[PDB]
DNA sequence: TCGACGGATCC
DNA sequence: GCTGATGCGG
DNA sequence: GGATCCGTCGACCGCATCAGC
């Protein structure tokens, strides 16, 4: 079935006005993405901050559009340290974020481009491309041993501030996530080592999956679709790209929005509105 | 994500 | 710059 | 022994690389 995303909500559970707007974009290719309009979607949507993976794009060859963007002019990315076209995340930012950090503190997990952290005044902001377990799960055992290391690393980030984490955790949580759940319990995605790493991440840092917070049974809400079979057509998709909030940022949720129409890759932009 | 292959089983 | 092959993705 | 039924498999789409000039 297809899937019309509600309307914005941009008052919190108090009322308090929405003061900040994220929107988080699996790019998948930033160059492909910027000739097929992308930019020109964000400056209509016009978020305070705007995190991109798969950028698939080395820091040299960023093309010169992306300094046209005043309302996100501190921009900071990260490419994989010897894998050119692969992998890639970025942040950019309106208002300078205090601080800045690339990966996650370990050795075997920074070497791809895969995390950018920010912290702000009030809360600290990651972005992820969380490594794919691959075409007959050649990557099933790395992704497990990732999985534990960036839950360890995002409980210790939580514990000395509010945790926004967003991008493509490459994982549909729940059989709700995804079209044809049946026919992909042995697939990239969903497996149930990747499913049960997802849950133990909600449980031990913790953190609350916006999205499903505030709409815990509405089926057919994808922000994925294969390119190949007219996959997006058909809404045949998965949920893979979330905001993940630490537990006290609930009541500064506004709402978390699956922007289903914007074209130019193979996910959809999510966008998350927080009253801070 | 399909649809095509089997091999298997049941009426 | 152009072809043709390969890596990667979920 | 004709149909139906499940695992298994291999090709489609798209972007960006690489090898070779």
Redesign the pocket.
Known sequence: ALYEDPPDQKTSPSGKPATLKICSW?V??????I??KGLDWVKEEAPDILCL??????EN?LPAELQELPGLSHQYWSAPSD?????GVGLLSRQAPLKVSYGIGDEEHDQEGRVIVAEFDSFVLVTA???????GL??LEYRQRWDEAFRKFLKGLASRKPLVLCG?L???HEEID???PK??K?????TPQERQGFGELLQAVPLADSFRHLYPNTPYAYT????????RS?N???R?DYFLLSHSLLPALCDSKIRSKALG???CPITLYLAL
């Open positions: 699996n998948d290719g930033l160059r492909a993405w000739k097929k993976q798969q950028t698939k794009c080395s060859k894998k050119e076209g692969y992998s491309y969380v490594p794919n377990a691959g075409r050649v990557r493509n490459n994982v549909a995804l079209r044809n026919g992909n042995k697939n990239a995605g969903f994925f679709w294969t390119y190949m079979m007219n996959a058909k045949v998709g998965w893979l890759s193979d996910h």
